[PDB]
């Protein structure tokens, strides 16, 4: 079991073909989950399931530059379930992060932060029990 919030260093930054896998279980009555791929203080890719935003479940994605959030990209397909185990896979492709949950494609997020090799840590936070956080090359 891993302590949340959890920092996963990404040595040498991300690169196309890098696959990050997060395994955990959503807490009962969860409100949020967040993955934050960081370039220093900037957040290149924030992936933020929200379980009750005005009585809707939505995934909010964004980038934070110089402490300012940009334009949100919202996905209404919501594969997380309170109380249940999940797998998030984030595949770095040349032009986007590609995210699958429980082996099903969920969304893509076009690279706004383009210095991929400088995106050198992943923060994992929110209302989960974190089981595993790892990476490999495919
Ligand atoms: O509610 C405050 C507002 O800035 C938005 O919430 C922020 O959204 C970020 C991503 O865009 C982060 O998730 C941050 O943690 C969160 O506070 C909010 O999403 C509004 O834009 C809704 O209209």
* CATH code of the domain covering residue 61: 2.60.120.200
The pair of structure tokens assigned to 66 is 């110089």
Cβ atoms of 78 and 59 within 8 Å: the answer is yes
User: Exposed, middle or buried: residue 115 (CB in 10 Å: 0-12, 13-18, 19+)?
Assistant: exposed
Q: Helix or strand or coil: residue 116?
A: helix
Residue range of the domain that includes 17: 1-138
Q: How far is CA 1 from CA 4, 132, 133, in A?
A: 9, 7, 10
Q: Is 73 annotated as a binding residue?
A: yes
Q: Count the neighbouring beta carbons within 10 Å of the beta carbon of residue 5.
A: 12
Element (H, E) at 138: none
The pair of structure tokens assigned to 21 is 């896998």
Instruction: Determine which residue's CA is closest to atom 10 belonging to ligand 1.
Output: 62
What resolution does the deposited structure have, in angstroms? 1.0
Instruction: Determine which residue's CA is closest to atom 7 belonging to ligand 1.
Output: 69
d(CA 107, CA 77): 9
Q: Is 39 annotated as a binding residue?
A: no
Count how many Cα atoms sit within 13 Å of the Cα of residue 114 in the half-sphere of its side chain.
Answer: 1
Instruction: Determine which residue's CA is closest to atom 23 belonging to ligand 1.
Output: 72
d(CA 47, CA 109): 9
Q: Helix or strand or coil: residue 99?
A: strand
Pairing of β 18-26 and β 6-9: unpaired
d(CA 110, CA 116): 12
Domain count, the chain: 1
Going along the chain, which residue ranges are E strands? 6-9, 18-26, 33-39, 42-53, 56-65, 68-69, 73-75, 85-92, 96-101, 104-110, 121-126, 128-137
Cβ atoms of 24 and 127 within 8 Å: the answer is no
Q: Is 123 annotated as a binding residue?
A: no
Count how many Cα atoms sit within 13 Å of the Cα of residue 32 in the half-sphere of its side chain.
Answer: 14
Instruction: State if residue 48 touches ligand 1 by the CB under 6 angstroms criterion.
Output: yes
Q: How far is CA 45 from CA 54, 70, 136, 138, in A?
A: 24, 11, 19, 21
Instruction: State if residue 89 touches ligand 1 by the CB under 6 angstroms criterion.
Output: no
Contact residues for 30 (Cβ-Cβ < 8 A; gap 6+): 51, 80, 82, 126, 127, 128
């Amino acid at each position: 079991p891993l302590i949340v919030p959890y920092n996963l260093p990404l040595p040498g930054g991300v690169v196309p073909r890098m696959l990050i896998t997060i395994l955990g279980t959503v807490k009962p009555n969860a409100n949020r989950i967040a993955l934050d791929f960081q370039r220093g203080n900037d957040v290149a890719f924030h992936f933020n399931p929200r379980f009750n935003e005005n009585n809707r479940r939505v995934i909010v994605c964004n980038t934070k530059l110089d402490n300012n959030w940009g334009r949100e990209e919202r996905q209404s397909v919501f594969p997380f379930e309170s109380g249940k185990p999940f797998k998030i896979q984030v595949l770095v492709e040349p032009d986007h992060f590609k995210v699958a949950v429980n082996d099903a494609h969920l969304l893509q997020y076009n690279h706004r932060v383009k210095k991929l090799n400088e995106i050198s840590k992943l923060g994992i936070s929110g209302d989960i029990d974190l089981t595993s956080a790892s990476y490999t090359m495919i």
